Design a protein around this ligand. Structure first.
Ligand SMILES: C/C=C/C(=O)SCCNC(=O)CCNC(=O)[C@H](O)C(C)(C)COP(=O)(O)OP(=O)(O)OC[C@H]1O[C@@H](n2cnc3c(N)ncnc32)[C@H](O)[C@@H]1OP(=O)(O)O
Ligand SMILES: C/C=C/C(=O)SCCNC(=O)CCNC(=O)[C@H](O)C(C)(C)COP(=O)(O)OP(=O)(O)OC[C@H]1O[C@@H](n2cnc3c(N)ncnc32)[C@H](O)[C@@H]1OP(=O)(O)O
Ligand SMILES: C/C=C/C(=O)SCCNC(=O)CCNC(=O)[C@H](O)C(C)(C)COP(=O)(O)OP(=O)(O)OC[C@H]1O[C@@H](n2cnc3c(N)ncnc32)[C@H](O)[C@@H]1OP(=O)(O)O
Ligand SMILES: C/C=C/C(=O)SCCNC(=O)CCNC(=O)[C@H](O)C(C)(C)COP(=O)(O)OP(=O)(O)OC[C@H]1O[C@@H](n2cnc3c(N)ncnc32)[C@H](O)[C@@H]1OP(=O)(O)O
Ligand SMILES: C/C=C/C(=O)SCCNC(=O)CCNC(=O)[C@H](O)C(C)(C)COP(=O)(O)OP(=O)(O)OC[C@H]1O[C@@H](n2cnc3c(N)ncnc32)[C@H](O)[C@@H]1OP(=O)(O)O
Ligand SMILES: C/C=C/C(=O)SCCNC(=O)CCNC(=O)[C@H](O)C(C)(C)COP(=O)(O)OP(=O)(O)OC[C@H]1O[C@@H](n2cnc3c(N)ncnc32)[C@H](O)[C@@H]1OP(=O)(O)O
Ligand SMILES: [Mg+2]
Ligand SMILES: [Mg+2]
Lengths: 260, 260, 260, 260, 260, 260
């Protein structure tokens, strides 16, 4: 379309996967205001399309995202940030009911690591790096860089990456638990599209319920989490795809889900 | 005894280890109602026996448990699931004060992985695979498959395993935090019995207090957890086994605990 | 000062690192009342000094800390725990706003792993062993050996280490998420001092805000944690170090923070 | 039936209300093991009856319950109270999905106030008294006397009632929030039965979902509580009673629910 | 814009109060989709206006709001609600940073009480009635009717109002804690406008901070609530209104706040 | 002792009550640093005395406490508020294991209401007024004026008191849940001393455990709180005061507690 910083397109088989690529080779894909607004518009378009079942958010081959534009947040004060709700349009990815895959190739510093951790699945290349360099410019992460990273890779590693700003490899992120699969830099997007197609081959309402159940593991207790999980498991016996799946399991055949 | 789906026997030295083996190779150890009732009866028997200190739950050599029997809940609706307390007898592993060790050899999909995660120690074999294939039949896990899995392996890996139904190897569950030790297939049961003997060689009340203190790490905050742990530690100076152990450590000898 | 159980000195470049060494080779650095009081005094002195930006806590080359002194708690009862509260001065390390690095060489059993887990960054040697052998003396951990360890390495591994008393290696602790970097025994102190220098090379108020934001990940929920992180990010635009760092990032130059 | 401590009968219009009366005029309805077992059996019978929609738990005209029986717990030690779970049969009232009305007439001290607070609706008479006299015998409440009372009447009033053992009137309990309606002594049971009839006149599944939604306000946060409430509101559009009620609201007629 | 269901106008002296009046006497102010969209637009306009400091939400003299439009959600199924995010535009009131005052005169049943409880201050009239009639139509409250009500009036009164549908008076809501002041029907609007003027007579950033500090008392713990409150109290010494007010208090004069 | 801002003395029968009076008629008992240090020293002295069972904090007949001293915090900035941990000594009252009774006569504005709410039992006079007038000077409460007040009197009343600064009466605080008893101005001290005597007439360790169990109702969930209460009840069987009280109840005599 008329997007300036992102490239929106429908990739994959049968046009069931949405690919949002960050195209900004002049600032290492800086998360400016216009880029975030275009990303939110693309996410809304992909969430208002019954043909799309999964979204893949990727960047470039040398850098996924360099964070927020430091050259846009420099001449700001406390009143100009608190009475303008700075970085309020960055919590729109966590309100998406469709799965979002984060293909990370290259530098993922500052806002890039947060944007990747706000996704369901994090796929990184063989030459990917994750770090929190906010401490080097006199600030701290403010979009989920000290909450999800601490519960994902551990307290010690998160403390180190936040207080030192050191870069970790994809192997360290796989060992700790930040990423789920290491892929080559030239085939990461293809494997991400294949994973999004696997995901989009299932019932959309059941996928949304499963995503909510998994996300409810960081907001409540174990007992209440299991109770909400059992309630959502009870509330799925009233759909049409559950019975179809159980019938295709009993009788040896393929399951055709009707998204209902 | 008269068990139709399980094999209950007292194993280990001095008959201090309870072994519950699921024996039904005709459905890959389907978690039906009768099997769950027999498992609960065996757990109650092993909890009302002052000679058993630890329980070892195991399955077969090709499949630990293939989940709930889908050939029974196929003709169930929302009314037959909500006001019938479906799967209500599956929360008996979290109410047992004695440690339960899970020996996974083969396929542990859905209900098997849930029952494994509801145990304290998870021991898997080299030829073992863990997955949650609920998204392929039109439902979601409802017995702890989206809460205990996310807090162990990570958000990304849990999201992938839930939304794709893919199978992970024992090495992946070991490097992620789901399995604590990788063992051969032909020696997993013996090493699990040895671990249960090393557990049942200490004070039963102190072991139960330690189990409660460890399980309280997912039900509240860090400060409240530390305070409850300190209170449970203060509540140990009123028993005889703590004093016996301290005297044996000071005098450099062996401690004979009397479970009191 | 005139400390008999610890050695306090200002190490590092420009005397910006506080090295607290535990010198008790006769009891494997037993955590007695006097040693803990001296540790708290050293921590308060290093906290009330404007020239210290990070603290490095270490022990010996064969044992970091063998836990609490059993010779001072063997003849205690239940009434001697609520009244004249025991282990009440061990919660002075989690109240320090400056980063505390832990260098573990040798045995870290009981109270040693508990004091190491209360630190932000944990550095272990190639021949370091972490364990919670409280179940072998009739007691349970009482200073965070069942809350932070469970959330760090996982439920299964923590259950095993607590109910069996077995020792793990530095490689397993790094793979599970207990330590952040494995260093040689003869060069662990130098790398810890270098990490403390790299940490103290930034603004102290921003480092304290980052430490609090990371520590608030085990005391609140994800939604409330994100809002608290956004608040702490908004509350840094009123300082001079943030603007100095942003200017040094835009006008590419060395950043000189005034710790204000 | 054959109950020697309680009187179980089916009261109300069309035999839709269960009335459990504590009959022990010699011990002021002491909460012994036999009485609690009979109460649990009566609750199970009323929960396995499709004709009963609400339960009314009442006592006598001078005392509802005097608390735990002292003549059976005096010769008990720590190893006889922490083991075997003495207070494990008293939490069978919060696991009931049918509404339980607690008609409190007379003395409600110790375990009686807890048994009343473990119900949905608390009805008190004119000469009603609530107190926590456990502090006068050297113990503390252990069945919800310091958790629900603190969140119901306030911190200060609960602190006073726990640390002093003073008795409060029914008017003070109504002004604070302990009870919701003050009824005469001679007509308390009749008004409780009428309230139970008005409750049972609605769909049982909808009433159970509403009870779960209300009870989820003391175990979760407001943000996640609202999400669980919306999910349970979504999960009611698949039943017949919701459509029947909406049709009887649109067209001027009465709603006849089929409990499905 | 020109509204047909609500009346948006600037009231009070100096045009500092925004009054939203629900004008639908033909359906007792039914909370339909268009009415909620107009209410959200009016709230956004009043929140993006640098002259409005508080909002007063009111209805009519006989009914504030009769709840959600039942004549539009009757022909809805489980799929048409969970995959359409029904009632997703009703959480736009708890995201407003400016204080919202609710003036209830008449019937506030179902969605009316839910909309009133999402406001900071709740002002009711003499002939005002609050109830939850959702149980009489086959559904449950789904917009905060079982979470914000239970934590205000008590568990027993909330259970009664939810499972019986009974109507309470303004005196009961004042004695329980649902409303803050009882005012006449012909002067409730004027006193609400005066309260909004007294609220908007202070600094807007400090008012927003206090509102967030009070709202954080239901989403967090007391210990972390105190820490967040102390942080928000520290983060106010960098504004121009705090020092102005302190200087005016020291010099015994009036403080002229500039919202900065 | 030689206190210039407070008056410390032992009152009550047998010198079992510690009366701490705030004597500063020139500033309406301003909470300055010296006054807070003296209050903390007096609290520590009264908590380390085996002849003191309860503490009674009070002020004057015209004003209990006017809050923090504005004359020493006017020229403070964000750097002098985040650093040095300003107001860190105001959290020494919530760490006392002995009950603290608050006698409020006159004005209790700002810090006075916070110090009163940090106590267990709140006793106000007939001429007492509670308010949070921080919004009138440009700041917000920072010592529990927005966390305990919201849970005590409700959301609406707390919002009004914080955003308007209006003063409430003792009757409103009692009907809302802030205070527990209304007493005359000249006899409030005698009734508080009698309440402290009735509290100190029991076992100190059991009273401390009850206070902790009541305070754990604002930091944990309902299930976890009930479980911690049950654990404390089981631990109470390790002292002699419980057995003495039960024996005195069985043999119908007065119980003599020895705090062990
Ligand atoms: C809640 C959110 C919090 C935050 O995210 S705060 C910001 C956090 N991010 C950072 O602190 C670091 C951002 N980037 C860098 O430090 C470095 O770059 C790299 C480490 C990524 C390495 O890149 P290198 O090889 O050194 O080249 P280069 O010249 O510095 O970058 C090329 C162009 O990219 C612009 N750029 C890089 N990062 C940002 C950014 N965060 N905001 C705005 N622009 C950025 C640069 O300035 C420059 O542009 P020009 O040629 O015009 O000078
Ligand atoms: C809260 C609870 C949630 C849940 O657990 S929902 C259910 C989730 N679990 C699953 O979806 C796994 C279902 N099982 C399978 O997908 C496959 O099977 C396996 C991958 C485990 C193995 O496949 P293969 O090696 O090809 O063997 P095979 O012939 O399909 O199974 C052999 C026999 O075992 C029956 N069986 C397997 N799983 C179940 C099951 N979950 N419920 C009932 N029966 C099952 C089969 O049907 C068949 O039996 P027959 O010969 O009579 O056709
Ligand atoms: C809140 C939680 C509190 C707790 O931590 S409870 C206690 C938990 N900690 C433990 O259980 C560890 C106890 N220590 C040991 O088990 C062993 O030691 C080692 C595993 C560390 C192996 O050390 P080895 O090579 O076998 O030599 P050695 O002779 O036992 O130790 C040398 C000296 O060190 C003293 N010592 C060791 N640990 C402690 C301790 N925890 N408290 C007091 N002293 C200790 C010993 O007794 C002995 O001293 P001497 O030669 O005078 O007899
Ligand atoms: C997890 C929960 C733990 C708990 O709840 S512990 C319970 C807390 N402690 C109490 O409730 C005891 C306090 N009760 C009393 O002091 C008095 O009772 C009353 C306040 C109820 C007033 O009744 P009055 O008639 O004045 O005294 P009376 O003569 O002792 O009562 C008549 C009969 O009732 C028996 N009884 C009273 N309370 C209990 C009880 N809590 N447990 C067992 N029996 C009780 C008595 O013993 C006696 O019977 P007999 O004289 O023939 O022996
Ligand atoms: C998350 C959301 C949850 C919910 O809110 S679900 C819905 C829950 N709310 C209710 O159930 C309230 C419904 N009960 C009533 O509406 C009763 O009535 C009253 C208690 C308010 C008594 O009012 P009365 O004096 O009997 O008059 P009248 O029957 O209401 O006629 C007035 C006109 O107002 C329409 N109306 C009233 N409430 C609603 C509504 N909630 N939705 C749609 N229309 C409503 C009526 O139908 C009728 O209209 P016409 O004259 O055209 O028949
Ligand atoms: C985390 C905590 C945050 C906070 O607590 S902020 C402080 C509480 N916030 C407030 O805004 C409270 C202040 N408002 C007042 O203090 C009013 O006064 C009163 C309503 C309490 C009393 O009014 P009146 O009867 O007219 O007496 P008066 O002449 O103003 O006070 C007599 C002397 O007392 C000094 N004083 C009163 N409050 C404070 C205070 N909070 N800090 C310091 N001094 C105070 C005054 O200034 C004056 O003294 P002089 O005669 O020497 O001028
Ligand atoms: Mg891990
Ligand atoms: Mg109240």
């Amino acid at each position: 379309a008329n997007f300036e910083y992102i490239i929106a397109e429908k990739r994959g088989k049968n046009n069931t996967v949405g690919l949002i690529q960050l195209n900004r080779p002049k600032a290492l894909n800086a998360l400016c205001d216009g880029l975030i607004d275009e990303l939110n518009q693309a996410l809304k378009t992909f969430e208002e399309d019954p043909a799309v079942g999964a979204i893949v958010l990727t960047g470039g081959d040398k850098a996924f995202a360099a964070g927020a534009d430091i050259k846009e947040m420099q001449n700001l004060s406390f009143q100009d940030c608190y009475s303008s709700k700075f970085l309020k349009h960055w919590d729109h990815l966590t309100q998406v009911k469709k799965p979002v895959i984060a293909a990370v190739n290259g530098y993922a510093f500052g806002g890039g690591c947060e944007l990747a951790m706000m996704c369901d699945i994090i796929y990184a290349g063989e030459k990917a790096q994750f770090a929190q360099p906010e401490i080097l410019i006199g600030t701290i992460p403010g979009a989920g860089g000290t909450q999800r990273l601490t519960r994902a890779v551990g307290k010690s590693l998160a403390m180190e990456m936040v207080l030192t700003g050191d870069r970790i490899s994809a192997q360290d992120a796989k060992q700790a638990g930040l990423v789920s699969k290491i892929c080559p830099v030239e085939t990461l997007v293809e494997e991400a599209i294949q994973c999004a197609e696997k995901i989009a081959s299932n019932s959309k309402i059941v996928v949304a319920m499963a995503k909510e159940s998994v996300n409810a593991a960081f907001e409540m207790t174990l007992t209440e989490g299991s109770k909400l999980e059992k309630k959502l498991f009870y509330s799925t016996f009233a759909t049409d795809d559950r019975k179809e799946g159980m019938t295709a399991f009993v009788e040896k055949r393929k399951a055709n889900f009707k998204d209902q």
